[PDB]
């Protein structure tokens, strides 16, 4: 490997061999159907709200999130990089697709890129491949990325990727090299109900100011989710020549293209705008160059996708964010690609600038850096919706991130309490917009009834003064029809209204305690939320009562009476609202929430403190279980700088107990914090959720330990999550971190919002 020296891959990059076969991957542990797309995954390409494309470590473009809210895992075989090499003085060269697999169609191409001949690396938003093959004398690498940039709401939105190639000749002979990008005209891949290829056509643009690009579109001007353009292209650099082929048939053997490329690495330069009928078609862009001994060359390619309209299953059509910058008519893929090819070096430097403070901190282990950056994949990958107007129709751009794909709910608030740390820390204007969306819902009432999945009772959809569980589903009407989730009735949940208040005050504190206007916007809703939750205190101890039914985020784990979890969240939310009332000079609110806080705090301690930890609750059969998340309210109080809600000594005892038990008694501390443990050191079997590790709960718990000076415990607690997710000894969950796993390592709900809580460790 001579090429690693010519490029700059950080040591914290997650690595795997191209074509590596991972043994003992995990699978779902539920009885009902659940997504399992295998361990062949990679860092995604694409901006927020753009739709994303997962290119795997094997090289294939395979995990398609272009239909916003949907996950479609299928390798589109035509979409590849390929290489040709010929040593000067040899009769023939060699050509090879850079994909460790094979299709079917395209039989003429050279498939099956060999094992032990290159590596994949990822430190999101960058990823790299290196090609170090005994039969390719010139070594190659590519750095691929999208311009995902904190505090930037422009380039971060773009439907674009850059592929910056480096080629180096370590031999003492001249070598002719070509690199070719092929792409299928994928108009019609989704959204089009009939005639899926009909009207697709490809054009070639030559911009000599030099860029050569293919634009793959359709003759129709219909404004529908399926219509728009893909583009691939390359920028000329000194010493390379460009060739292209506008149209090859993807539903054929591929030899129309491959007989050209495999001869001398130079395409026919044949333009052909003829639309197709039933055949699939594609385009190819190639560079050819001669490398002398010891020579390096760098050449950038790009990919864009102008698919301006997203459609949701309830019928609404919206423009995607990036259309603010490029237009809405679906004929702008070249403009996007050109912007990338002319600015990518600037984008690289912007990414480096944001990653450097963390990477350069030599007190932090590399594994922690691997996880911290790579868990950010989900902000783009999570079905992200970011609108720039309804089709046919404002100041703001509404946003939503999915819980996951299995449970297709936007912005699920009980989960975003954990998962939204990156947004407040790195994209705070998005965060505050999401919270205003919630503020706007609090007094919505919908008295129509739904059947509750868990018990088949009927319940009201949305109750005035209750915060909604979620802002809809991609199968229905995001932002318009809220509370799509129906397994339980969230109108009686005991965590949502407290978590809402906590999120609001968090968002003020972590953006510098300056945004009084945000506090003013949300203040009515904060007071309403707490006032409604107080009505659920049926025994007058000052604390809302859990009802012996899963009425909080652990939506199968029953809490009854006063719980540590909901009780502590309530205490913290009261303390937050007192502080907001001080800031806004609302005396009656300050006085009232202070009174409620002092009574609730005294009763919480009396009811739950056992001398070692806080009991799970007051009335359940396993009320003395040790819950990993028992002090969630004090965790957030630390972040919000609200001081001690509970005594320091008791918090420290509780954290030490959770480490000793839920971590170190659970598979020797190598898999995270199990949710519930009995005081005899045995995992609590009262519900499945008690026997699960929740990845995002565990990362949050690690930040709480860290703030409380339990440094070793904090990083040991988090390390098990990192190991399970990314290490050779784990279960193969990279770029699909799940909600949960059990002792056996098998999972529930891959591609999950909650583990974004790792960013709470950077507060
Ligand atoms: O019922 S589930 O879909 O599995 O629940 C999950 C989703 C819910 O929207 C969320 O509130 C809940 O915390 C999750 C627990 O893993
Ligand atoms: Ca009570």
Which of 406, 475, 486, 555 to mutate to test ligand 1, by most ligand atoms within 8 A of the CB atom?
A: 555
Whether residue 60 contacts residue 75, with contact meaning beta carbons closer than 8 Å, is answered with yes
> Within a 13 Å sphere around the CA of 57, how many CA atoms are in the beta-carbon half?
25
SS3 per residue for 193-247: CCCCCCCEEEEEEEECCCEEEEEEEECCCCCCCCCCEEEEEEECCCCEEEEEEEE
Cis peptide before 269 (omega within 30 of 0): no
The two tokens of residue 178 are 């070509």
Whether residue 619 contacts residue 607, with contact meaning beta carbons closer than 8 Å, is answered with no
Dist CA 49 CA 67 (whole Å): 10
Confirm or reject: Cβ of 493 under 6 Å from ligand 1.
Answer: no
What is the secondary structure of 251-263 as a DSSP string? TS-SHHHHHHHHH
User: What is the atom index within ligand 1 of the atom nearest the CA of 414?
Assistant: 11
Beta strands in 558-614 (DSSP E): 560-561
Resolution (A): 1.4
* Ligand 1, atom 11, residue with closest C-alpha: 553
Confirm or reject: Cβ of 555 under 6 Å from ligand 1.
Answer: yes
Other Cβ atoms within 10 Å of 278 Cβ, number:
9
Whether residue 185 contacts residue 77, with contact meaning beta carbons closer than 8 Å, is answered with no
Whether residue 266 contacts residue 316, with contact meaning beta carbons closer than 8 Å, is answered with no
Q: Which residues surround ligand 2, an ion (CB under 5 A)?
A: 537, 539, 541, 543, 545
User: What is the atom index within ligand 1 of the atom nearest the CA of 556?
Assistant: 1
CA diameter of the chain: 91
Strands, sheet with 139-145, edge to edge from the N-terminal-most edge strand: 14-17, 118-123, 126-131, 139-145, 160-168, 296-306, 229-235, 211-218, 200-207
Number of H helices, E strands in the chain: 16, 31
Confirm or reject: Cβ of 319 under 6 Å from ligand 1.
Answer: no
DSSP letter at 614 equals B
* Ligand 1, atom 5, residue with closest C-alpha: 555
Whether residue 532 contacts residue 577, with contact meaning beta carbons closer than 8 Å, is answered with no
Residue 490 has φ and ψ, to the nearest 5°, of: -75, -10
User: From ligand 2's centre to the CA of 541, what distance in Å?
Assistant: 5
Other Cβ atoms within 10 Å of 89 Cβ, number:
7
Confirm or reject: Cβ of 403 under 6 Å from ligand 1.
Answer: yes
Whether residue 458 contacts residue 451, with contact meaning beta carbons closer than 8 Å, is answered with yes
Is 205 annotated as ligand-binding? no
Nearest ligand to the CA of 553 is 1
Dist CA 55 CA 325 (whole Å): 26
- SS3 of residue 662 by DSSP: helix
H/E stretch holding 641 reads none
The two tokens of residue 185 are 């005209």
Provide the CA 338 distance to its chain's centre, in angstroms: 27
- SS3 of residue 593 by DSSP: helix
Dist CA 130 CA 593 (whole Å): 59
Could you tell me which of 478, 477, 596 has the C-alpha nearest to residue 527?
596
The two tokens of residue 256 are 């129309």
Place of tokens 């939750």: 533
Could you tell me which of 320, 240, 249 has the C-alpha nearest to residue 282?
249
DSSP β-bridge partners for residue 557: none
* Ligand 1, atom 13, residue with closest C-alpha: 553
Whether residue 143 contacts residue 298, with contact meaning beta carbons closer than 8 Å, is answered with no
Q: How was this structure obtained? A: X-ray
> Within a 13 Å sphere around the CA of 125, how many CA atoms are in the beta-carbon half?
29
Residue 750 has φ and ψ, to the nearest 5°, of: -65, 160
Could you tell me which of 376, 367, 417 has the C-alpha nearest to residue 715?
367
- SS3 of residue 145 by DSSP: strand
The two tokens of residue 569 are 């969240």
What is the secondary structure of 272-308 as a DSSP string? --PPPSSS-EEEEEEEEEEE-TT-EEEEEEEEEEE--
Dist CA 238 CA 241 (whole Å): 8
Whether residue 283 contacts residue 247, with contact meaning beta carbons closer than 8 Å, is answered with yes
What is the secondary structure of 444-503 as a DSSP string? --EEEEEE-TTT--EEEEE-TTSPPS-S--TTS-TTTS-----SS-GGG-SSHHHHHHHH
User: From ligand 2's centre to the CA of 537, what distance in Å?
Assistant: 4
The two tokens of residue 40 are 């062949």
Alpha-carbon distances, residue 554 vs 307, 415, 418 (angstroms) = 38, 10, 13
SS3 per residue for 51-85: CEEEECCCCCEEEEECCCCCCEECCCCCCEEEEEE
- Distance separating the N- and C-terminal Cα atoms of the chain: 39
Q: Strand 160-168 vs strand 61-65: parallel, antiparallel, or unpaired?
A: unpaired
Confirm or reject: Cβ of 629 under 6 Å from ligand 1.
Answer: no
Nearest ligand to the CA of 406 is 1
Confirm or reject: Cβ of 553 under 6 Å from ligand 1.
Answer: yes
Dist CA 189 CA 183 (whole Å): 13
Other Cβ atoms within 10 Å of 727 Cβ, number:
17
User: From ligand 2's centre to the CA of 629, what distance in Å?
Assistant: 20
Dist CA 702 CA 761 (whole Å): 7
Whether residue 322 contacts residue 215, with contact meaning beta carbons closer than 8 Å, is answered with no
Distant-in-sequence contacts of 73-76, Cβ < 8 A, 24+ apart:
73/37, 73/38, 75/101, 76/184, 76/186, 76/189
The two tokens of residue 549 are 């039914």
The two tokens of residue 432 are 């505050």
Round the CA-based radius of gyration of the chain to a whole number and report it. 27
The two tokens of residue 629 are 């998340």
Confirm or reject: Cβ of 414 under 6 Å from ligand 1.
Answer: yes
Dist CA 654 CA 640 (whole Å): 20
Whether residue 329 contacts residue 191, with contact meaning beta carbons closer than 8 Å, is answered with no
User: What is the atom index within ligand 1 of the atom nearest the CA of 487?
Assistant: 1
Handedness of CA 191, 193, 196, 201 (dihedral sign): negative
Is 207 annotated as ligand-binding? no
């Amino acid at each position: 490997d001579k090429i690693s020296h010519k490029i700059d891959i950080p040591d914290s990059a997650w690595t795997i061999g191209i074509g590596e076969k991972f043994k003992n991957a995990g699978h779902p542990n539920v009885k009902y159907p659940m997504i399992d797309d295998s361990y062949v995954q990679g860092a995604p390409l694409g901006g927020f709200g753009a739709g994303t494309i997962g290119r795997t470590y094997n090289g294939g473009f395979s995990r398609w999130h272009l239909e916003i809210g949907k996950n479609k895992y299928t390798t589109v075989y035509a979409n590849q990089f390929s290489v040709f090499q010929k040593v000067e003085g040899n009769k023939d060269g060699v050509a090879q697709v850079l994909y460790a697999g094979e299709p079917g169609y395209l039989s003429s191409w050279k498939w099956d890129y060999p094992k032990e001949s290159g590596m994949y690396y990822a430190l999101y938003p960058n990823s790299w491949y290196t090609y170090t093959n005994k039969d390719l004398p010139v070594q190659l690498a590519v750095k691929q990325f999208s311009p995902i940039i904190p505090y930037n709401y422009k380039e971060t939105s773009y439907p674009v990727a850059v592929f910056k190639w480096t080629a180096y000749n370590p031999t003492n002979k001249n070598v002719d090299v070509s690199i070719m990008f092929t792409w299928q005209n994928m108009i019609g891949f989704f959204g089009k109900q009939v005639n899926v290829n009909s009207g697709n056509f490809n054009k070639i643009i030559k911009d000599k100011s030099e860029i050569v690009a293919a634009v793959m579109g359709n003759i129709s001007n219909d404004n529908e989710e399926w219509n728009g353009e893909y583009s691939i292209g390359v920028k000329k650099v000194p010493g390379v020549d460009i060739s292209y082929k506008a149209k090859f048939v993807t539903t054929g053997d591929g030899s129309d293209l491959w007989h050209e490329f495999s001869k001398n690495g130079i395409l026919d330069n044949k333009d052909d705008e003829t639309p197709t009928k039933q055949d699939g078609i594609g385009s190819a862009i190639a560079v050819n160059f001669k490398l002398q001994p010891g020579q390096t060359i760098e050449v950038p390619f790009a990919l864009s996708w102008d698919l301006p309209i997203m459609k949701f299953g309830g019928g609404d059509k919206w423009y995607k964010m990036y259309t603010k910058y490029f237009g809405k008519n679906g004929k702008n893929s070249f403009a996007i690609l050109k912007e990338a090819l002319n600015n990518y070096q600037k984008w690289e430097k912007m990414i480096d600038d944001w990653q450097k403070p963390i990477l350069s901190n030599k007190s932090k282990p590399d594994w922690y850096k691997t996880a911290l950056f790579n868990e950010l994949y989900y902000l783009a990958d999570g079905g992200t919706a970011w609108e720039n107007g309804k089709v046919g129709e404002r100041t703001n751009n509404m946003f939503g991130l999915l819980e996951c794909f299995d449970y297709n709910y936007y912005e699920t608030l009980d989960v975003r309490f954990y998962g939204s740390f990156p947004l407040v820390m790195l994209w705070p204007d998005i965060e505050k917009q999401v919270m205003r969306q919630f503020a706007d819902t609090i007094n919505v009432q919908d008295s129509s009834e739904f059947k509750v999945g868990s018990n088949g009772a009927m319940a009201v959809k949305k109750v005035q003064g209750m915060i909604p569980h979620d802002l809809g589903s991609s199968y229905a009407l995001p932002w318009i029809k809220i509370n799509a989730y129906d397994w339980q009735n969230p109108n009686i949940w005991k965590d949502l209204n407290s978590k809402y208040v906590l999120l609001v005050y968090r968002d003020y504190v972590l953006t510098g305690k300056t945004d009084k206007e945000f506090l003013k916007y949300t203040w009515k809703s904060v007071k309403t939320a707490l006032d409604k939750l107080k009505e659920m205190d049926k025994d007058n101890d000052g604390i809302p009562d859990n009802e012996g039914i899963p009425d909080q985020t652990y939506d199968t784990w029953s809490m009854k009476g006063t719980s540590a979890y909901c009780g502590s969240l309530w205490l913290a939310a009261l303390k937050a609202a007192q502080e907001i009332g001080k800031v806004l000079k609302d005396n009656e609110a300050y006085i009232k929430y202070n009174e409620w806080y002092k009574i609730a705090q005294q009763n919480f301690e009396k009811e739950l403190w056992n001398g070692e930890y806080y009991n799970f609750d007051t009335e359940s059969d396993h009320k003395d279980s040790i819950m990993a998340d028992q002090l969630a309210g004090q965790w957030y109080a630390d972040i919000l700088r609200l001081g001690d809600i509970l005594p320091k000594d008791h918090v420290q005892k509780a954290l030490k107990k959770i480490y000793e038990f839920n971590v170190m008694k659970f598979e020797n501390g190598k898999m995270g914090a199990v949710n519930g443990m009995r005081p005899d050191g045995i995992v609590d079997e009262s519900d499945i959720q008690a026997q699960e590790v929740w990845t995002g709960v565990t990362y949050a718990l690690a930040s709480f330990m860290k703030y409380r000076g339990m440094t070793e415990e904090a990083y040991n607690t988090a390390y098990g999550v990192y190991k399970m997710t990314y290490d050779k000894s784990g279960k193969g969950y990279w770029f699909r971190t799940p909600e949960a796993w059990t002792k056996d390592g098998n999972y529930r709900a891959s591609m999950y919002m909650r583990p974004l809580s790792i960013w709470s460790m950077e507060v």
